[PDB]
Design a protein around this ligand. Sequence first.
Ligand SMILES: [Cl-]
Ligand code: NA
Length: 147
Amino acid sequence: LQNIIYNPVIPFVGTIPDQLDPGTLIVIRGHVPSDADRFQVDLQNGSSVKPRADVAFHFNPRFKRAGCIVCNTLINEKWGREEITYDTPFKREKSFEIVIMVLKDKFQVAVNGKHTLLYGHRIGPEKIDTLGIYGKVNIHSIGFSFS
Ligand SMILES: [Cl-]
Ligand code: NA
């Protein structure tokens, strides 16, 4: 992998060092603490907080009850229609690997080597230049494979 970041402080906000062209991978390895409620991986158009940077792809594992993953997009500080996946591989106290693959029409995400979900583009992926990781999660490494 390319442009690897080790043991970042959370919240992490970093510039993605090349374009997210089809076939590009974002690989995030970490673990979920025992008290986690949720965490998220946000692919953003910049890092502004005011107005808040648009979020092309919000990938949001939630741990209450049986758990799920919520995905959405934030445009001009308004969330769109949530996409929910109930078949969640994440668990408190367990390590994980997330691989986000950028495709022409969508993202595809695999967790722990297994296909997890698709998310159709709502913002042009060319507008994504920033990776945010927030919430109750421990990140070991972030790396990229650019196409
Ligand atoms: Cl948020
Ligand atoms: Na945020």
